[PDB]
């Protein structure tokens, strides 16, 4: 069974993770560096799957293969605590998250039924340069670990983790970064999700949020109302000409945190250049024509399960927000207005970076979900949420 709390985690033994090069849940980490040395020789054979299943690297350039992956995740990926909502990553979003610069086809690691060819399992790695305290290391980011519901509790997920580890080792990479809503050995940081209602009537009707006993629907509407247009002078969508300055602003801004990406200019283009219904980035171009700030948020809707009328929830997720001349509070206020303008029902943000400076003021409510951050094969002290400067998808 999975552990969502540190209390429930302390009472668990981790048959798989105890075999892995990560610190134990109990210990305090006093050192910096790899848990074990880099391997001089790597297993050449893929790990064995239960009888009747086979590995298959997924070419996401094939529209039908991408749609199979969409469907696996849409029906079997992450749900909320009460099994009411499930992530519904779009096919085009998956292309964005899984084909950044340097992506490798063998790192899109699928499991198929031999007879029917049904896709029943998945895990992915993408390369990323990660700055962790005083070290910069080429790592991978692991995402989208998914096992079909009919296939769970058959230790397929440990096989998926070992197989992607093997395939990453073959490329000479020995560390990874990843998040999870469960506690595992051993988080480098724990972040909390906060939620800012944008369409509170829909959120309440579908039981995403609850009307407090001391608040009417009418007061809830007024509490969350926003302006019709943003207030910041010179706010506009990011364009191709802004890629260098956005790269520069981000690089300088991230230096104050202890876990951050190190992005090339091409990676900045990939992660921030606006794509409708995937990623939005707005820059502030001032009266001199100079770009001084930017905000970004990605699009991640969810399925509303077993509901007759409302089928989906449109969520915006705070990505990276850089301020040098505009107050962060004004920047995020305009992000809320832009998300509302674009039809989003809720705006989500973690308590990492400097987000705690605006969460309560802009009327975010604290969520029931922690997002733990992990490093594989790297020992270092844990850090508070406000020093985590890394957002995944």
């Amino acid at each position: 069974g999975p552990a969502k709390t540190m209390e429930e985690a302390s009472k668990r033994s981790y048959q798989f993770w105890d075999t892995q090069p990560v610190p134990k849940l109990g210990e305090v980490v006093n050192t910096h560096g790899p848990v074990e040395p880099d391997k001089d020789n790597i297993r050449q054979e893929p790990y064995t799957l239960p009888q009747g299943f086979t590995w298959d690297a997924l070419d996401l350039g094939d529209r039908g293969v991408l749609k199979e992956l969409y469907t696996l995740l849409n029906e079997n990926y992450v749900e909320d605590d009460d099994n009411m909502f499930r992530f519904d990553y779009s096919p085009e979003f998956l292309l964005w998250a899984l084909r950044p610069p340097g992506w490798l086809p063998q790192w899109h690691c699928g499991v198929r039924v031999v007879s029917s060819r049904k896709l029943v399992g998945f895990i992915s790695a993408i390369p990323a340069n990660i700055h962790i305290y005083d070290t910069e290391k080429k790592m991978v980011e692991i995402n989208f670990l998914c096992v079909h519901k009919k296939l769970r509790s058959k230790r397929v997920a440990p096989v998926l983790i070992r197989e992607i580890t093997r395939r990453v080792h073959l490329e000479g990479i020995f560390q990874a970064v990843y998040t999870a809503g469960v506690v595992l050995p051993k988080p480098v940081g724990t972040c909390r999700y906060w939620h800012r209602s944008l369409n509170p009537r829909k959120l309440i009707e579908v039981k995403f949020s609850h009307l407090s006993r001391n608040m009417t629907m009418q007061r809830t509407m007024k509490l969350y109302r926003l302006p019709e247009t943003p207030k910041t002078a010179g706010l506009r969508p990011m364009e191709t000409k802004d890629i260098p300055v956005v790269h520069q602003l981000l690089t300088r801004y991230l230096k104050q945190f202890h876990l951050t990406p190190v992005m090339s200019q091409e990676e900045v283009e990939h992660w921030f250049y606006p794509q409708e219904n995937i990623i939005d980035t707005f820059v502030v171009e001032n009266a001199n024509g100079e770009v001084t700030d930017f905000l970004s948020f990605y699009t991640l809707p969810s399925t509303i399960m077993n509901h007759p009328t409302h089928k989906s929830l449109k969520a915006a997720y705070s990505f990276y927000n850089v301020h040098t001349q505009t107050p962060l509070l004004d920047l995020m206020s305009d992000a809320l207005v832009l998300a509302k303008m674009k039809g989003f029902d809720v705006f989500n943000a973690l308590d990492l970076m400097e987000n705690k400076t605006f969460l309560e003021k802009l009327k975010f409510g604290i969520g029931d979900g922690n997002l733990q951050y992990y490093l594989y094969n790297w020992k270092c002290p844990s850090m508070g949420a406000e020093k985590v400067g890394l957002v995944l998808q």
């Binding site: 992530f87 670990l145 999870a180 949020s209 989500n348 029931d368 979900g369 922690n370 997002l371």
Partner: peptide, 8 residues
């Protein structure tokens, strides 16, 4: 992976 949160 990510985690699905909702208001406490």
């Amino acid at each position: 992976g990510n985690c699905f949160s909702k208001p406490r």
